[PDB]
Write a protein that binds this DNA or RNA. Structure first.
Ligand SMILES: [K+]
Ligand SMILES: [K+]
Ligand SMILES: [K+]
Ligand SMILES: [K+]
Ligand SMILES: [K+]
Ligand SMILES: [K+]
Ligand SMILES: [Mg+2]
Ligand SMILES: [Mg+2]
Ligand SMILES: [Mg+2]
Ligand SMILES: [Mg+2]
Ligand SMILES: [Mg+2]
Ligand SMILES: [Mg+2]
Ligand SMILES: [Mg+2]
Ligand SMILES: [Mg+2]
Ligand SMILES: [Mg+2]
Ligand SMILES: [Mg+2]
Ligand SMILES: [Mg+2]
Ligand SMILES: [Mg+2]
Ligand SMILES: [Mg+2]
Ligand SMILES: [Mg+2]
Ligand SMILES: [Mg+2]
Ligand SMILES: [Mg+2]
Ligand SMILES: [Mg+2]
Ligand SMILES: [Mg+2]
Ligand SMILES: [Mg+2]
Ligand SMILES: [Mg+2]
Ligand SMILES: [Mg+2]
Ligand SMILES: [Mg+2]
Ligand SMILES: [Mg+2]
Ligand SMILES: [Mg+2]
Ligand SMILES: [Mg+2]
Ligand SMILES: [Mg+2]
Ligand SMILES: [Mg+2]
Ligand SMILES: [Mg+2]
Ligand SMILES: [Mg+2]
Ligand SMILES: [Mg+2]
Ligand SMILES: [Mg+2]
Ligand SMILES: [Mg+2]
Ligand SMILES: [Mg+2]
Ligand SMILES: [Mg+2]
Ligand SMILES: [Mg+2]
Lengths: 116, 110, 53
RNA sequence: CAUAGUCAAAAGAAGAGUUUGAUUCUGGCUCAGAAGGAACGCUAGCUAUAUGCUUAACACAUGCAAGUCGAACGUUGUUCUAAAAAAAAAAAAAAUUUUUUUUUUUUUAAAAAAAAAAAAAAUUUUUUUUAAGAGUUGAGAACAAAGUGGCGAACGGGUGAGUAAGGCGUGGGAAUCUGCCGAACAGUUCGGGCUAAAUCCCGAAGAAAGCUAGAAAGCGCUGUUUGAUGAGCCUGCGUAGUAUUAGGUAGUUGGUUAGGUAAAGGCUGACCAAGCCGAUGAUGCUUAGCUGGUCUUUUCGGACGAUCAGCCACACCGGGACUGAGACACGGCCCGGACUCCCACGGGGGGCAGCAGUGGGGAAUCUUGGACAAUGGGCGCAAGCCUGAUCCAGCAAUAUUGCGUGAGUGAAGAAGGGCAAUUCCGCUCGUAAAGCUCUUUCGUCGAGUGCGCGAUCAUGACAUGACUCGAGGAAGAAGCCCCGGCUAACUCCGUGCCAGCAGCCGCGGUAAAACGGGGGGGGCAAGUGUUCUUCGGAAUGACUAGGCGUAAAGGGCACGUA
């Protein structure tokens, strides 16, 4: 996301000594066995890399889960306060409404009696 | 099997590659799960080649068992996401290379 | 060949302009960018303006 | 500090001619623009990248387009030979031997080292024949030679016939399965059968299957939990024309109960009810694959759905299932049909809408090419082997804001052509040409390096290319339409309502700027015209953005359903 995180926390690596490490044997059969062992070692290293990546993704998922839960509980707390404030305002407005409606009803009752 | 492989882009005699996460049965330039990056097989003005990868998505696909193809194994070793392929231990073929210098701007012998 | 490996996605960004880059030499080692390579990085970024002149 | 910072996401809005004696209005016709999978005429230098049977889903000669694995398994038959390690270079015709250390067995408790014929020596040696269903014959090479078995031939590739909603676009769901691939756990035991065997088939437990001390803790298989990827099933919304088609349905709509399916379900047997769909257009008829998108356009719309990619459907025409993780399967099987090729006449065989290619139809659409070097895919532990996927060459101005066909100078203003009271070198072709100087892009010719590059551990079809250097000589490279108005560009001769021209208005009946030729000129330019087709102009179906007194157009007038 930023230059500093990448520039500090990148594993820059040394030269790899595996490159050019083959020594030619005197028997083609032994050479084939040596190449087969090299393929098996490559499979083992790939499996270790897969396990490392599984653990990295799991830790990132756990962190995202706890962050989302924290935001959710903060949001719920804010909504629980907003709801109670609006309920109090609605209650005082409904209490103000009744006197006006009673007076208006009395006015209309007087008008109907006059017309009758 | 999910495969990290190379799709051909570019034009005729100007190859360019994209690094893809695909089902193996898919056509080479057809259906895919994800574009993971790119690779330029032609050398540029800086004297080297270019490559971009989505490192976290490549880690995701390798963690769930995707299998890289033969050039993608080399490209992922070169970026540090995979171990070196078994054949890089053999070393390079030698021989007398023509080391006579050519001018960078004009291509003629200095 | 040396390569120049860019990190793509939102988690590989060096900032507004692209992703972070390293070199990865043919011997198996990787290194940060040179000054010439830094100029190459700077000249290929997209510019957030119309073409003046 | 900094590989920081910068906040861009459009442009696109034109009018003209033609109804009248003239006018304004209404209203059509036509024109200037952009474009195409185009076709045809005339004319053509080059490179590159795209595109190239739109018609007959017409019929197809020929070659190729799917195999691979001996590390699953026997089988027969080919060859050749009768213990391991190390050294042999120097004095008095030469491949195979001598020396040193380990090791199996035999012979007389330490040492020594199959039968028959012919010959030699005192039991051994030399040569030859048969050895080897044989008191374990010791190594080796191919076995492809033919098979059984696994995996893949459900991918990739082609076409758009059908399909108007069982499809597609978009968003969801529950009642399912999922080979190979990643990650845990448990097992991998014993009999029989296919002439011989098995990782083939059957049986028992609990499901199975073994190979490799050549691949011995490496593969493989089975069961159970999972991730990942696919697949099946369902569904909301959106998605033609036609009412000069008004009713349609009878497993139809629902219920119950059995069956079937991996899985919900009238999916279907039986029984029961009479429902369900329809004027918010069912059903009938016609047309059509859908989408991303392509062309056009001041936004909207219209036309199209060809290349490419996603989804679907189909594979000579109909009908089926089998095997399989997956098919009701383009290059698999069975059946029926039409057509066709062999037949020894009993009977067999085939399916280019894979890549090339051929007939045919058509105005019209390409090579019977090269390589698996790259990328992708199948099989294999690999080595590899396949791959008309692809990559790359070939043909075609079919397309593309590309490049070139020279740059200067030159007055005998040459010759020649055209016009001319026949004005100013009489005017013009015309500085035009020729000549002279310079530069050689593109193309041509001759060479040279190649881990230049595509590809790297290695492997290069392209490549007779490219690159670099050299030779040469303006040399090899300009047309097509038009010139009465719309519309930029005018004279002479011929013709005489003829021959002809024409997008529209109109020209031609003896001085035609309109027909045809000469001369000159204008626009585009390796193109340029003509035809077809789409949008624009067209506010000419008007949402944006029009109307209905007298021009097309208020229903004769109400009442009322949606
Ligand atoms: K789709
Ligand atoms: K059919
Ligand atoms: K290949
Ligand atoms: K033409
Ligand atoms: K010339
Ligand atoms: K009413
Ligand atoms: Mg009139
Ligand atoms: Mg076609
Ligand atoms: Mg087989
Ligand atoms: Mg098949
Ligand atoms: Mg198929
Ligand atoms: Mg195609
Ligand atoms: Mg199509
Ligand atoms: Mg209808
Ligand atoms: Mg059709
Ligand atoms: Mg459509
Ligand atoms: Mg046919
Ligand atoms: Mg199969
Ligand atoms: Mg089955
Ligand atoms: Mg076929
Ligand atoms: Mg063909
Ligand atoms: Mg014809
Ligand atoms: Mg491959
Ligand atoms: Mg494999
Ligand atoms: Mg081919
Ligand atoms: Mg051009
Ligand atoms: Mg040249
Ligand atoms: Mg040459
Ligand atoms: Mg090379
Ligand atoms: Mg060529
Ligand atoms: Mg004019
Ligand atoms: Mg005349
Ligand atoms: Mg004219
Ligand atoms: Mg004329
Ligand atoms: Mg309109
Ligand atoms: Mg308009
Ligand atoms: Mg309106
Ligand atoms: Mg009007
Ligand atoms: Mg009105
Ligand atoms: Mg009236
Ligand atoms: Mg009337």
């Amino acid at each position: 996301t930023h230059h500093r995180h990448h520039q500090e926390t990148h594993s820059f690596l040394e030269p790899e000594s595996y490159i050019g490490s083959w020594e030619a044997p005197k028997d083609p059969k032994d050479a084939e066995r040596m190449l087969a062992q090299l393929r098996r070692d490559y499979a083992k290293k790939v499996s270790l890399y897969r396990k490392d990546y599984v653990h990295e993704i799991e830790m990132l998922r756990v962190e995202k889960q706890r962050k989302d839960e924290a935001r959710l509980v903060a949001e719920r707390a804010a909504n629980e306060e907003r709801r109670r404030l609006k309920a109090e305002a609605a209650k005082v407005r409904a209490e103000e409404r009744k006197i006006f409606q009673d007076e208006f009803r009395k006015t209309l009752m007087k008008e109907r009696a006059e017309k009758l | 099997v999910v495969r990290l492989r190379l799709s051909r882009l570019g034009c005729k005699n100007r190859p360019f590659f994209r690094v893809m996460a695909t089902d193996s049965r898919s056509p080479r330039d057809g259906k895919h799960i994800e574009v993971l990056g790119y690779f330029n097989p032609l050398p540029g003005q800086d004297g080297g080649k270019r490559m971009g990868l989505k490192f976290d998505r490549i880690k995701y696909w390798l963690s769930v068992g995707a299998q890289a193809s033969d050039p993608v194994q080399r490209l992922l070793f070169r970026s540090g996401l995979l171990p070196p392929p078994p054949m890089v231990a053999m070393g390079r073929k030698g021989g007398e290379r023509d080391t006579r210098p050519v001018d960078p701007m004009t291509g003629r012998f200095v | 060949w040396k390569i120049t490996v860019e990190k793509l996605g939102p988690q590989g960004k060096r900032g507004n302009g692209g992703g972070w880059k390293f070199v990865s030499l043919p011997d198996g080692s990787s290194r940060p960018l040179n000054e010439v390579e830094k100029m190459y990085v700077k000249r290929e970024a997209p510019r957030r303006r119309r073409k003046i002149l």
